Every structure is written in C-alpha cells, then in structure tokens.
C-alpha cells in the first residue's frame, strides 16, 4: 500500500521542510523525527487562510514553524488564486535562504510548485529533496 | 528537478483517474494523454466548493469528469473539514467500482487519503497505479 | 507484471522520440501523449526495411515521423547488419542535433545503440531519458 | 550513461535467461556471469531467422543455449511476423516450464512479450525479472 | 553522496527494528525517529561479544532494545562464525514473532542474513521493509 | 525476497571493488562476475584481524585482492575501534586512488564508510556507485 515519502534520518544540520496546502500533513512527521535527531528544522507552511493545520503541534515539535496564510479569493478561478500561493511560496524562500544558511531543503507539495520552489534553491546552492 | 508523476503510457481499458484537493493540476495532464492513448478514463475530483479547477478543461478530455464539491465549514479546524472530504472520497469511490468496472486506478492526492482509496481499491480487485 | 516505461507528463517542448527496431511499438504511445499535451516530438524508427512499423499511425500522432529503412544484407551474421542501423542511427541524430534544437531526446531500444546515441547527445547538452 | 540491466549476483540455482530480437546481446554478459557464480543458466533466443547472434559464444558460456529462428515472412506487415515470434515464445516456455523445473526466470525483450512471457511464469509460480 | 536507508516515518504500530553486526549504527536513528512518531519499537542487535554498540542509546530512544553477543571464536574461519551469529538471529526472531504480535519489521545487515531472516517473517503474515 | 545489490555487467576496466567488515561477502560474488566479464578488478577488504574472510577465493578471481586487517582493540567502546577501520579506509583508497588510476568504484558497507569514502573518490574524478 501507498506510504508517507521514506526519507532518511541523518543530521543534515539545518533542515527547511517546507509543506505547501495539505501537504504540511505529511511533512509533520517528518520534520518531528528530523529535529528529535539533532537537526534544527523549522517547517513553512504555505497555504489559504481557511486551511492552516497543525500549527500547534509543530511549534512544539521544530525549532521555528512559519505560516503563510494566503486569502482565499471566491471571486475568481481556483488557478487564479493558486497563483497567489505560489508567489508567497517563491517570496518567503527566497527570503530565507538570502537571510539565513541552510544545509537541506525538503518540500511535499503540488508538483508546480515544486518546480518553483527548486529553482529558487537551486540559485543557492543548497540541496533539495522532493517527495 | 522535480517532474510530474512518471507514469506508463498504455492501454489498460477503462481508467479511474483520482485527484483530491490540487492534485487534480496534476492528474489533468495524465488523464489527457490517457484518453488520447485510447483509454476510457473518468476522472474523479475530489475537494471543497471553493477549489474546484480545471472542471471545464477535463470533461473535454476524458469521457467523464466527475467532481464532488465537499462544503468548507469555517467553524471547525481544517482536521475536522479534511475528514468530510475523506468520507466523499471512500463513498464515491466504493459506488463506483461497486457499480461499473474498471481495469486501473490512478490517484493523487494526501497519502492519508491515498491509504484509505487503497482499502476501497484492494475490495474490488482492481489495480492501482 | 511489466508495463511501459514510465514517464513523466509534461511540456519538454520540441522532442526527439527515438524507437530503434520494434522498440517504436513502445515509444508510439508514449509519443502520441506528449504531442497531445503540448510537445513538438517528431519520431525517428531506425530499422530494416522489412521492419517499419506504425509509420502511418505516429505520422498522424506527432509534428513529424522519420523512417530510415536500413538494407537487410543476408549474406552476412546478423551482428554484420545491426551495425549498419547503428551507424545510420549516429548519424541521423548527429544530422537532427547539429540541425535544429531540441529541449529533449527518448529513447528505446538495444542498450548498445543507447549508448552510441547517448554519446551524440552528450555532444551537443540535450537533455535524455535511457533504461 | 546507460548501463545494461543492473541485476544481483547470486546463485538462485537454475535459471532460465531469455532474450527476444536483439535483446540476447544484453543478456550475454549476464547469463555468461550468473554461470560462473554457480548458477545453471540455460539462455532462450526467439527472434526471426536472419538475425540469430552470439550463438556459439553463449553455448561455451551457460549449461544450454537454445534458439528459435522463426521465419521472417516479407508478405506481411512486420506486425504480423511479430506476432509469430510471439506465439513461438509462449510455447516454448510454456514447454520448458511444464517439462524441467527452474528456480528464476529472467528476460529482456519488447514490453509485449515481457508480458505474455510473464503470464506463463505466473502460472508455474517460477520467480520473475524483467530488462 | 550516499545517504541512510529513506525510510517512511508513519505508525505502523509495533516494529521490530533489526540491525545486524555495524547494521546497528544505521537503525539507530531511524529506530529513535519511528519511537517519537509514536511507534512501539524494540530493537534488536545480533553481533560478536567484542562489537555491541549504541546499546545505552537505544534503550533510551525505543520501548525495548535486545542485544544477543555471540562469541567470537578465533580458532575458525570468520565464516565459521557469521554462521553462529546467522543462527543466534533465527531462533530470537522466531522467538520474538512466535511469542509477541509485530505490525512491522525492518532489518539492515549482510544480504544473507536479510534472506533468512525474511523466511522467519514471512512465516508469520508479518510485513518487511529491507 | 531480499537479493544482492543488482549491479549492472559491463567491461568498465579496472575496478575497485571494496567491502568493508562482512561487506565482502557480498563483493565477493560481484567482483568474481566482473572479473570473468572482462574487467580488471582488485578487491579490498577493510575489516577487524579476526574478521577476514573468503581471502584465500578471491585472490582467485580478481587480479589482486588487498586485505587491511585493522587491530581489535577491546579497551575501547566497539565507535573507538571503527573509527580505526574508517581511517584505514580513507587512507588505503586515497593511496590507491592517488596511486595508480580507475573506471570506476563500488563500494559494499556500513553508510558511514561510504561516505568517507566517497569523498576520497569525488576527489579523483572516479565514477562510484554504493550499495
């Protein structure tokens, strides 16, 4: 049967686990072991306004949890509004890896974004695993 | 860099292709070339009333478009509202491989929901991607 | 059991769908999607001349379709022969490359001719996809 | 660049390594490889008659080497001579299946026979592997 | 570069994480993970008397960690010896799938002990990640 | 069920086929194919003094089989001592690497060592591959 995406446990040093929509729900668990392991992760979500989850419980579990919460326009196509998501996804990593270092970068999330997001890191430097 | 789903290029028959939430972006793509291939493939989307995408785009590609719009209710955490789509998601599922027959199943979405489309799937006997 | 190669579905651009021998049964639907959705692949089947197959089919499924029948001499091994669709093999792809441009180049068929042709197109920084 | 087939190294004890058209070249080096570990490798070759190869050097390197030359009628289109080599190559696994006993079964070939040969394996409950 | 074995961090519910000689070092972290992710793991380390390790660690991180130290015989081939330990690995698996119900059993060691260690667990309906 | 590590069978020419503690044993049946194939593989077992095994059989099938038989010493946890076999490790590769020139590496062992050894094989511009 299908299973969350195998990663492996090693200390990297400083993770970006990064989970856009729902798919912050299967980063959390990982996140969570990678910090228990001795790295300093600290997640993003990216997603619309009405649907951030979790936030709690990985405030507790990494060093550091960023969400960016995106209105959710009803007056307009849903791609339109994914367009939004998209932009605030490339913004806030853009932002991070040009503020801080990092030694890994870890994203779950449409593979559009993916894609965006990648060359974003891919500009720094820094290695990337995508689910 | 990351790349859409590899997926075969074949004729397996009549295909259920599955998209929950914005997974449905990247099942579109697949079903398409699916159809031209010469597959029966419907397609199932699964999400809230306010995220529904590419509905117009894919009736026109696959022989049938299916989408079950769950309502997001704003008074509960989104755990709770994913839960409804879950339950749309096995229901609709069920009633369509307990009514017609398929030859593959193809889906996308949480590996939450991807699970508990497996149980539904592994019932009838039919493959999944 | 088996399936076709797995591929992924995207927009590449203009590609070269390469199917030497019966290897073009294979890459025929594989080709027809990625043209379908939004992809310029023009297809070479490199094969002996009583070996065509599907020429009308992927000529009405892609931008373009090339077919380059190789003479099957019987008075010599096998071996003798296959080495004349591998050179012709080089040299219609060094013919396509140092001619137009492409985003991407697949193939299938014999290892041995995959990696002759990979050789061609690690020449000129095309992206491949081998097995 | 492309490799041939990445395969594991060890004694499964008799095997059954075949290869359809041209796919015998690729099986040599591995069937030649598996004998000298200890394994009892007899290699199958279907293809048409004018293009058996590496016969003798595959007899010297497994327990057996057998090849069935099916004739290549120019009368049809090439699909239809397929189709015989097909037919010729269920039936004579079906035969060394129901005959002999084998403890693996490897092949390489198209993917349409790699499917119909699969069939037959599962039906004898032989394990499998494919190109 | 070469990384450790990816693994899926889900509850499977009771797992039995197998490391075998320096296999251990491997399981380690991937046994401390699965724990804190709300995994019942007991792990379990089959090697020479001379070659425990992290043992203090992990039966920090998992519910429940088992060490079976073979002696290590000088006066034989070390094959002589790997043939010991193989052994020491059957009967506690056995042992373990015959006494107590696992959802789940992973194992990282020699190839030849992944085999005989997987006709343990397939003669108990018990699922494997190699 | 679990099988050895599928590797591909090419003449890649001289090969570094390393194994460290009970990696060898499963190196063993790999660099013994490799050999017969074509290739000029040298082994290399790094292991405790009263670990070495299949010595005496692979001197037999490769061009050279090397044995650094590391001291146990047990007045230090079983970390102080691998940490001797680590750098045994770097440093025989690195003399060999430095030494005389190789196609390509492969390398069976604890994912630590790999590591270290990897390093050590980026450094030349030698293509590896793990287990």
């Known amino acids: 049967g299908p299973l969350g995406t195998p990663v492996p446990m090693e ?4 993770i970006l686990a990064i989970g856009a929509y729902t798919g912050i729900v299967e980063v959390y668990p990982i996140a969570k072991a990678w910090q228990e392991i001795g ?3 600290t997640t993003l979500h990216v997603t ?4 951030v989850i ?4 990985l405030e507790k579990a990494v060093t550091r949890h960023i969400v960016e919460p995106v209105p959710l326009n009803p007056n307009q196509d849903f791609l339109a509004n994914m367009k939004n998501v998209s932009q605030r996804l490339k913004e806030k990593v853009r932002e991070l890896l040009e503020s801080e270092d ?3 970068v870890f994203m779950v999330g449409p593979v559009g974004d993916q894609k ?3 060359e974003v890191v891919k ?3 820094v290695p990337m695993l995508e689910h």
Do not use: A, C, R, S
Not at 54 to 57: A, F, S, T, V
């Open 11 to 14: 200390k990297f040093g400083k």
């Open 48 to 51: 619309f306004e009405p649907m």
């Open 123 to 125: 500009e720094y430097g």
């Open 39 to 41: 790295n300093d992760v």
């Open 116 to 118: 965006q997001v990648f």
């Open 102 to 104: 990092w030694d890994l």
């Open 54 to 57: 979790l936030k709690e419980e």
